[PDB]
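Protocol check, entry for the methods section draft. Step 1: assemble the input record (protein sequence plus ligand SMILES). Step 2: submit for complex structure prediction. Step 3: store the C-alpha cells unaltered in the notebook. Ligand used here: phycocyanobilin. Step 1 record:
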Amino acid sequence: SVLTKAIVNADAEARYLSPGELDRIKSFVASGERRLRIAQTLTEARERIVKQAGDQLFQKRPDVVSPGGNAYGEKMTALCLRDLDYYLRLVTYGIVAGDVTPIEEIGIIGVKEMYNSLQTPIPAVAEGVRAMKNVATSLLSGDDAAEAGFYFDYLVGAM
Amino acid sequence: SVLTKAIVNADAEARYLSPGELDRIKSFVASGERRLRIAQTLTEARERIVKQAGDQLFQKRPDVVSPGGNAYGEKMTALCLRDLDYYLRLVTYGIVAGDVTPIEEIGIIGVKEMYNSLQTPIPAVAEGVRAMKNVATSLLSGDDAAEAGFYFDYLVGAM
Amino acid sequence: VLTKAIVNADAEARYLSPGELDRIKSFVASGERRLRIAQTLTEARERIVKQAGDQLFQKRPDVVSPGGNAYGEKMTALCLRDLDYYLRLVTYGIVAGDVTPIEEIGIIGVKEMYNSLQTPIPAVAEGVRAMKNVATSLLSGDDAAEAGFYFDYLVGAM
Amino acid sequence: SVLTKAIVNADAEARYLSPGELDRIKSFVASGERRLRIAQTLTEARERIVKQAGDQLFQKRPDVVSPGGNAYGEKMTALCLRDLDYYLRLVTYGIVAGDVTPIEEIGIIGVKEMYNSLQTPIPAVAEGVRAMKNVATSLLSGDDAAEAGFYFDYLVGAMQ
Amino acid sequence: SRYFKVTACIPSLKRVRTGRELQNTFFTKLVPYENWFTEQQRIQKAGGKVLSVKLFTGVQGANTG
Amino acid sequence: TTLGPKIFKLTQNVGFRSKGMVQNAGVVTVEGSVQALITAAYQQIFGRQLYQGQRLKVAEIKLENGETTVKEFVRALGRSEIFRKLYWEPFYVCKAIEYIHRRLLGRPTYDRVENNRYFDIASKKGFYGVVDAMLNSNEYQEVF
Amino acid sequence: QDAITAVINNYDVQGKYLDGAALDKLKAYFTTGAVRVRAAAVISSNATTIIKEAAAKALIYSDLTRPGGNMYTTRRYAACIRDMDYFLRYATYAMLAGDPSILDERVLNGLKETYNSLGVPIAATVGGIQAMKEVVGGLVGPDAAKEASIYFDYLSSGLS
Amino acid sequence: QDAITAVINNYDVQGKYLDGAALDKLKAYFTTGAVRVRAAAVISSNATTIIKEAAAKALIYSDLTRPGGNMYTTRRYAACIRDMDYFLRYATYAMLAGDPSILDERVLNGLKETYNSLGVPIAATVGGIQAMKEVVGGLVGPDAAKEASIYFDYLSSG
Amino acid sequence: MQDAITAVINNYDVQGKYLDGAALDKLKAYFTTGAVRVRAAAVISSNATTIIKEAAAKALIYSDLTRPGGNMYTTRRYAACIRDMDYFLRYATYAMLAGDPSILDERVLNGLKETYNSLGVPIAATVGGIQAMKEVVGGLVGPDAAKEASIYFDYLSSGLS
Amino acid sequence: QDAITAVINNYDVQGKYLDGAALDKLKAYFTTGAVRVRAAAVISSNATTIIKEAAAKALIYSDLTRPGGNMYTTRRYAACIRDMDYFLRYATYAMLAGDPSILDERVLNGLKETYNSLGVPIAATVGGIQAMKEVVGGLVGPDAAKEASIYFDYLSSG
Amino acid sequence: QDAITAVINNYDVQGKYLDGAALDKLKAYFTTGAVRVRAAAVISSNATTIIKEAAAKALIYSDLTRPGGNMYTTRRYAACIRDMDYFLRYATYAMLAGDPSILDERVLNGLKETYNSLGVPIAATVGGIQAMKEVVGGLVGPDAAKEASIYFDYLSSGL
Ligand SMILES: *[C@H](C)[C@H]1/C(=C/c2[nH]c(/C=C3N=C(/C=C4\NC(=O)C(CC)=C4C)C(C)=C\3CCC(=O)O)c(CCC(=O)O)c2C)NC(=O)[C@@H]1C
Ligand SMILES: *[C@H](C)[C@H]1/C(=C/c2[nH]c(/C=C3N=C(/C=C4\NC(=O)C(CC)=C4C)C(C)=C\3CCC(=O)O)c(CCC(=O)O)c2C)NC(=O)[C@@H]1C
Ligand SMILES: *[C@H](C)[C@H]1/C(=C/c2[nH]c(/C=C3N=C(/C=C4\NC(=O)C(CC)=C4C)C(C)=C\3CCC(=O)O)c(CCC(=O)O)c2C)NC(=O)[C@@H]1C
Ligand SMILES: *[C@H](C)[C@H]1/C(=C/c2[nH]c(/C=C3N=C(/C=C4\NC(=O)C(CC)=C4C)C(C)=C\3CCC(=O)O)c(CCC(=O)O)c2C)NC(=O)[C@@H]1C
Ligand SMILES: *[C@H](C)[C@H]1/C(=C/c2[nH]c(/C=C3N=C(/C=C4\NC(=O)C(CC)=C4C)C(C)=C\3CCC(=O)O)c(CCC(=O)O)c2C)NC(=O)[C@@H]1C
Ligand SMILES: *[C@H](C)[C@H]1/C(=C/c2[nH]c(/C=C3N=C(/C=C4\NC(=O)C(CC)=C4C)C(C)=C\3CCC(=O)O)c(CCC(=O)O)c2C)NC(=O)[C@@H]1C
Ligand SMILES: *[C@H](C)[C@H]1/C(=C/c2[nH]c(/C=C3N=C(/C=C4\NC(=O)C(CC)=C4C)C(C)=C\3CCC(=O)O)c(CCC(=O)O)c2C)NC(=O)[C@@H]1C
Ligand SMILES: *[C@H](C)[C@H]1/C(=C/c2[nH]c(/C=C3N=C(/C=C4\NC(=O)C(CC)=C4C)C(C)=C\3CCC(=O)O)c(CCC(=O)O)c2C)NC(=O)[C@@H]1C
Ligand SMILES: *[C@H](C)[C@H]1/C(=C/c2[nH]c(/C=C3N=C(/C=C4\NC(=O)C(CC)=C4C)C(C)=C\3CCC(=O)O)c(CCC(=O)O)c2C)NC(=O)[C@@H]1C
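Step 3, stored output:
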C-alpha cells in the first residue's frame, strides 16, 4: 500500500515521515472511497471480463490453443483462464491499496521463472492482461478507467 | 522535488515509474497551482514574518539576547534575523517543490556542525522557526496553513 | 584446451604442471581426428539442418502457425538460418576441443536476444536436439559421442 | 583430489560441472590405474627407500647425528627415520589423489612451526626428502619417476 | 549524484607478491562524491600517490542536488 | 589452502584491454573470469543467485568495462533495494546487523563494541549508514 | 504490514475477491487516516521534547540516574534515550499503518532477551514508554490519543 | 534534476526569494505535467515493443547483424538492445522531469568515448534512437510527442 | 567436502597405515565406475530444467500446494520451491561424481530440517519431489548410472525425513 | 616520516654510516622534542576553538559565506570546517614528528587536484590556514610558535 | 588467445565454415606444438638459473644494486627478480599458445605507466629481458630458440 511504501522508505533513512510523504498519504485516504467503488465494479464484472479477454487472446494467438501450444486442451485452457482470473483479482487488490506492492509480491516476483518451468509463453500472458484491460476499461467510467489502466499497464510491463 | 524523488527511486530499481508513483505525480501537478499561491503569500509577508518571529523568540528566550548569549549585540541580532530569513526562503522553495529535498540540501545537512562552530544553540534556532510558523499560519488560510506547517515542522525536526 | 590450461596456471602464478602439459600433448594429437569429424558434419551440414528443422516442426505445429514466430517463408528461413548458425558453432567447438568458442558466439545474451525477437527458447533447444540426432546417425559411434557432448552443452545452455 | 577440486569450483559458481571440468575428471579416472601401480611400487620399496635415504642424509649432514645434533642417539635417530617414513607415506597418498592437497594438509601446513619448537633443522629434513626422491626414482620407470618426482619436489619446495 | 574519476598508483612496500598486482597498483576508478573522501585517505595511508582527480558527473558547486 | 573456501580476485580488466589484433574476435575469452566473479558476488552477498527482474545489470556493466572495481560493485549490492528488502526490513534491528555483518565482512561480530558501533550508526542514519560503515571499515580494506 | 494490506492478505489466502464486508473495514481505516497523518506530524516535530518530558517524568531524578543505577554514566544515559527514540519512531509508524505488526517484527522481537543479557530493567523501560504515551496524548489531542495509546500499550505489553 | 529544482537553484545562487516571473515558469511546467505522466505510462507499457519496432526499422536485416558487423554474435546483439532500453528509460525520466540534465549525468557522459573505443558505430546508434522516437511519437499522441521528441533529439545530439 | 578416493586415504591416514591391497581394491572399484558417472552427470546437467518440470508435474503442481493457501501458492513461493529442487538435483549430481555422500551433509543437509520447520515448508512434500526427481533421472541416465544416482537421492530424502 | 628517520634515510642513500654531524642534527631534535609535546597537548585541547577563531578571522562575514559563495549552504560550510580540522590535526602530527613529509604524503597529496575540480578557492583556504597559525601561535607560546609556524607555512605553500 | 582460436575467429567474422586451407594452418601449429612443449619444460626446470644468469649479465655488480640505485635494498632487489620471473613465465605461456596476445593483455598493458610512476628504469629492464632471451636460447636449443625469441622480443618492444 501507499502507506507501507512510505514507512519503509522512512525506516531505511531512519527518519520520521517527510511532509511530502505525509501529503501523499492524505491524498490517498481521500481517494480511497472512490477506489473502493472502482474495485467493486470490476469484481462484479469479473466473470465476463475474463471470458471476453480469453476469447480475444485466443483470436490474437491461435498458436497457444493449438496441439503444439501450451494452452491447448480443456484442462490447459481452464488453467490459462484461471491465471487470467488470478491477475484480475490482483489488480483489484492493487487499486484499493493504491500501490502495486501487493500485486508485486503475489504475482510479479519469480513470475518469469515459474512460467519458464511451465513453458508458458510470457508475451501471450501479457496479451491476455492487455485484453482484460480493454474489457475492463469499457465497463469503467473514463476517469475510473485511467486509474485501473495504470495497474493493468504495470502488470503488462512486469511480464 | 517530489518528481526528483520518484525518478531517483525508479532509477535505483532500474525500472519505469510505478503506477502508484505516477499517481502521486499527478496529484502533485494538480496541487501545484495552489502551492504557488501559498508560496507567493509568504514571500510578500516575508519581512514582517521574520520581524515578528524574532521578537517572539527573544521574549521566549531572554538568554540568547544576553551578554553571554550568541544573539546578543546588534551585529549578532542581525545575523540571527538573517538566518530566520534564510529558513523562510527555504520553506517557500519546499512548498513549490512539494518535497523537503530542496530545503534539505541547502539547510539541513551539516546544520548541526555549522551551528556548533558558531556556538549558536540549535534549540533556540528551532524556536525561531516555530515562531515564524505561527506568524505565517495567521496570514495563511487554514488549509494553506496546514501545507505550510508541514514544511515548517520539518525544519524544526531537522534542527 | 591450451588456453584453459594457461589460464589456470596464471591464476596459480605457476609454470604449467606436467599433467597439464601432458593434456596439451594429447589434445594436439587428437586434433587431426577432431578435424575429420568436423569435416564430415560440414559436408552433411545442409541436409542435417533441413532434416532437423522439419523434424522439430512435426513435434510442435504451433511454432510454424499464423500466430507463431516461425510462420511464413521469411520467418521459416530465419529459423533455419539460426539452426545452421548453431551447427557451424558446434563444428568450431569440436576442432577447438572446448565449448568456449561456441559459448562466446552463441550462448551469452542468447536469452535476451530471443526474448526481444519473441522466439520461444525451448523450441530452439528442441531444434538443437533434433540436429544432434541427425548428426549422430551420420557419425560413427565414438565420433558421435564426442559430437554429442558439444550438442548437449548447447541444449543445456539455452 | 582432482574430483574434489572440480566440484568445489562448480559449487562456488553455483553451476553444474562444465564440459572442460568433466573432461579433466575423465582423464583422471583413466590415469588412476597407472597411478595406483606407481604408489604400490613405492609402498613395497618403502623400507629400503627410507633406509638408503637416511644413510645419504647422515653422510650429507654429519652434524645432525652428532652429540650436539638433534638426531643423535638411537631414540632420536629412530624418530628422524620415522619422519622420513611419514613423508613417503604422504607422497604415495598424493600420487593416488593426483593432487598435493592430501600431502599438504597432513604435512606441509604448520610444519615450520612444529619443527621450530622441536628445534629440528628444516633444511636437513628437506635434504632427506631429496634423498628419498633419488632412491625412489631409481626403482621407478622413467615416466613413473617423473610423476613421482613432482610430488617429491613439492615437499622439498614446501620445506625450507 | 556527483561522481569522481580518479587515477592513482599504489606501491606494495610491506611485502612482495608473486601474483600480478598491476590492477591493484595502477587503477582508474569512478567514485561517488561522498566515497571519494574516504578513498582518498585510503590511498594516502597506503602511501600511494593520486595522479589525477576529475569530477566525472555533476556541476561545479551546484547549490542543491 | 584447501582447508579454506575459494577466494575470487579480479586479476584483469578486459574493457581497457582492447585487443590489439582481431578486434572483432567473437571468441574473445577471459569474459568468463569476470562473469564468474559476478556470479560469486551474488553468492556471497545474497547467498543465492537472484531472480530475473532482481539482478542489477548497471553495476555489472561498469565492472565488465573496468569503470568500477570489485570494491565498488560490492558497494552497489549492499546499497541495493533488494538487499534491504531481504535482510534489513523483516528483522529486529540487531538481528539484521548481525546477518549483514556476516555477509559483508565474512565473520560474526567479535564483541559488544562492534555491535554497539553499528547500532548507534543505524539509529542516526538507518540501513544505509550501517552498510556504508561496514564497507568503509579499515578491517574491510585490509582483508579484501 | 498495514491495515489495508492485512485485509488484502487475508483475502488472498482465501483466494476470495474483495467483498463489501472487507470494503467496510478498509473504509473504516480511510476515515481514521486523516487524523493519524495529523498526529504523526505533531509527534515528529515534538519528538525531542516528548522524550525529554517522559524522561523527566520517570527516568531522571531517580535511583537509575544516581551512581549504581542502570542509567548512571553518560554512555548508559545516552543508550537509554536512544532506545526511547526508537520506541517513539516505531509507534508513530504503527499509528500511520494502523497495524501493530511492525512493532513485533522490528522492536518487540528479541528485545526481552537483549535486555536480560544487558541487565537493563524491563519495568523501568515500560514505565518510560507509558510516560511517553501520556506526553504524546496531550500533544496529539483526544481523538488521535486513543489511536496513539494502543500502540504504546502494545509495546509495553510486549516488553512485559 | 528537474524543472522545478532548476528554477529554485538559479534563485538560490542569487539568494532571491521566488518571484512571480519564476512562478510563471513553474506554472507552465505544472500544466504540461499531466500530459507527461500519461505519456510516461504509455511508454513503460509498450517499451519492449518500441524497442522491437525500432530495431526492425534500423538494426536488424542489416550488415550489423551479418557476420563481421558490430551487432553480430548473440552477446553483441544483446548489448545493443540493452543500450536501446537504457536510452528509452532515461528519455522517459527526462520527459517527466522536464529537464535534459539527467540525460547528461547518466547516459550522455563518456558515452562517445566508450563507443569510440568499442568501435560501436555512432551514426547507426543515432539512427536507432531516431527510430525509437518515431515509434514513441505514435503511441504517446501529438501533444506528448513534441515533449518526448526533444529528449530523444538531445540524446542523438549527444 | 570428501570424495571416495580421499575417504580411503583419510581412513588409512588415521590408522597411519600405508595403502594396502584391500584399500587399493576400493580405489580400483571407484575408477571403473568413474567413466559411467561422468556420462550420467552430463546427461543430468543438460536435462536439468526438464527433470525439475517433470518432477513438479508428478507431485507439486495441480495440487493444494499450488492452490491459494498452499505453501507453493504465489509466484514468489513457486519460484523458491523450484529453486530448492534445482539445488537438490545439482548437489546429488556432485555427490554422484564424488562417489561420497559427505558433500550433501556439509552443504545441503545441515540445518535444512530446522530451516524448513521455521519456514513452514512441508517436509513430506519436499521428500516426495526428491523421489520424483530420482525416478525421472533414472530414466535419462540409464540403468547402470541409475543405481548410483538413486543412492544420493535417497540420502537426501532420508536426511530431510 | 620523522626527523630521525629522515636523517637515517639520507645517510642510507649515500650508504654512509651515521656520523657526528648527523648525530648533532638528531641531538638538536631531541632537545626540541619536549617543547613540541607540550605544544601538541595545548593544540588538541583547544582545537575546536582554534578552528572557530580562524573561521571568524577569515571565512565568515565574507562573500564565501554569502549566497553564491563557495562556503554558502550548511553542507559546504560543514565541509570547509571539517577540512580546517584536518589541516590542524596533520600540522600537529608534523610538529611532533619534526618533519614536513607527512604533510606531503597525506594532506598535500591529491587535495590541490580535488580543490581545482571542485572549484574551491586555494587562496581562501590558504588564508584560513594562516589564520589558524596565528591563533595557534598565541596558545602554544613563543618557543613552540616558531616550530608550529613552519608546518602551517608548508601547508599554505603547498 | 591461441593459434587455433585465431584461425577460428578469422573464419567466424567471414561466417565461413572451416576449410582445408584453414585446416592446413591448424595442422602447421599442431606440428610445432610438440617442440614447444619440450621447450616449455626446459624453461620451467631452469627458470631460477635463467634469471640468475640474466641478472649477473645486466642487473648485478651495477649502480642499480649500489646504494641510491633502483634495485638497492632487499625489498627492491626481490621485486626486480620477481618481475624477471613474470616475464619468463608469460613468455613461456605465449610460446605454448603460439600467440603474442596474452603478453599484451597481461604483461604489456599499463607496464610503462606503472614503471614511470615507480621510477623503475625501462631500458635496464629491457636489457634484462634480452639477457634472459639469450640464456633461454641456449637451453631450449636452435629450433625452439627461434620460437622463444619472438615472444621475448615482443615483450622488449612493448616495454
Ligand atoms: C494463459 C493466459 C496462458 C497460460 C497459462 C497456464 N498456466 C498453467 C499453469 C499454472 N499457472 C500458474 C500460475 C500461477 N500460480 C500462482 O500462484 C499465480 C499468481 C497468484 C499464478 C499466475 C500455476 C501455479 C500453474 C501450475 C499448475 C497449477 O495450477 O497448479 C498452465 C497449464 C500447466 C502447464 O503449463 O503445463 C497454463 C496453460 N498458458 C498459455 O500459453 C496462455 C498464454
Ligand atoms: C537566530 C535564530 C539564532 C542565532 C543566529 C546566528 N547566526 C550567526 C552566524 C551565522 N549563521 C549562519 C547561517 C547560515 N549559513 C548558511 O549557509 C545557512 C543556510 C542557508 C544558514 C542558516 C552563518 C553562515 C553564519 C556565519 C556568519 C555569516 O553570516 O557569514 C550568528 C553570529 C555568529 C556568532 O554567534 O558568533 C548568530 C547569532 N543565534 C542565536 O542564538 C539565535 C537563536
Ligand atoms: C528457429 C530454431 C527458431 C526461430 C528463429 C528466428 N530467428 C529470427 C531472427 C534472428 N535470429 C537471430 C539469431 C542469431 N544471430 C546471431 O548472431 C546468432 C549466433 C551466431 C544467432 C543464433 C538474429 C540476430 C535474428 C535477427 C535477424 C537478423 O539476423 O538480421 C527470426 C525472425 C524474427 C524477426 O523479428 O526477424 C526467427 C523466426 N524462430 C522460431 O520460432 C524457431 C523456434
Ligand atoms: C628488474 C628487471 C627491474 C626493476 C623492477 C622493479 N619492479 C618494482 C615494482 C613493481 N613492478 C611491477 C611490475 C609488475 N607487476 C605485474 O603484475 C606485472 C605484469 C605481470 C609486472 C611486470 C609492479 C606492479 C610493481 C609495484 C608493486 C609490486 O611489488 O609488484 C620494483 C620496486 C620499486 C618500488 O620502489 O616499488 C622494482 C625494483 N627495477 C630495477 O631496478 C630493474 C631494472
Ligand atoms: C553545570 C556545569 C551546567 C548545567 C548542568 C545541569 N545538569 C543538569 C542535569 C543533569 N546532568 C546530568 C549529568 C550527569 N549524570 C551522570 O551520570 C554524569 C557523569 C557521571 C553526568 C555529567 C544528569 C544525569 C542530569 C539529570 C538529573 C538527574 O541525574 O537526575 C541540569 C538540570 C536539567 C534538568 O532539567 O534536570 C543542569 C542545569 N547546566 C548548565 O547550563 C551549566 C553550564
Ligand atoms: C531506557 C528507557 C532504559 C535503558 C536502556 C538501555 N539500553 C541499553 C543498551 C541497549 N539497548 C539496546 C536495544 C535495542 N536493540 C535493538 O535492536 C532495539 C530495537 C530496534 C532496541 C530497543 C541495545 C542493542 C543495547 C546494547 C548496546 C551495547 O552493546 O552497549 C543500555 C546500555 C546498557 C549498557 O550496559 O551499555 C541502557 C541503559 N536503561 C534503563 O535503565 C532505562 C529503563
Ligand atoms: C545498439 C543501438 C548499437 C550498439 C550497441 C552496443 N553497445 C555495446 C557496448 C556498450 N555500450 C555501452 C553503453 C552504455 N552503458 C551504460 O551504462 C549506458 C548508459 C546507462 C550506456 C548507453 C557500454 C558501456 C558498453 C560496453 C560493453 C558492455 O557490454 O557493457 C556493444 C558491444 C560492443 C563489444 O564489441 O563488446 C554494442 C553492440 N552497437 C551497434 O551495433 C548498434 C548500432
Ligand atoms: C575550507 C577552508 C575551504 C573549503 C573546503 C571544502 N572542501 C570540500 C570538499 C572536499 N575536500 C576534500 C579534500 C580534503 N579535505 C581534507 O581535509 C583532506 C585530507 C587532508 C582532503 C583530501 C575532498 C576529498 C572533498 C570532496 C569529498 C567530500 O566532501 O566528501 C568542499 C565541498 C565542495 C562542494 O560541496 O562542492 C568545501 C567547501 N571551501 C571553502 O569555501 C573554503 C575556502
Ligand atoms: C657474507 C656474510 C656471505 C656472502 C655474501 C655475498 N653477497 C654477495 C652478493 C651480494 N650481496 C648483496 C646483498 C645486499 N644488497 C642489498 O641491498 C642488501 C641490503 C642492504 C644486501 C645485504 C647483493 C645485492 C649482492 C650482489 C652484488 C652487488 O651488490 O652488486 C656475494 C657474491 C656472490 C656472487 O659472486 O655472485 C657474496 C659472497 N656469501 C657467503 O657465502 C657469506 C656467508
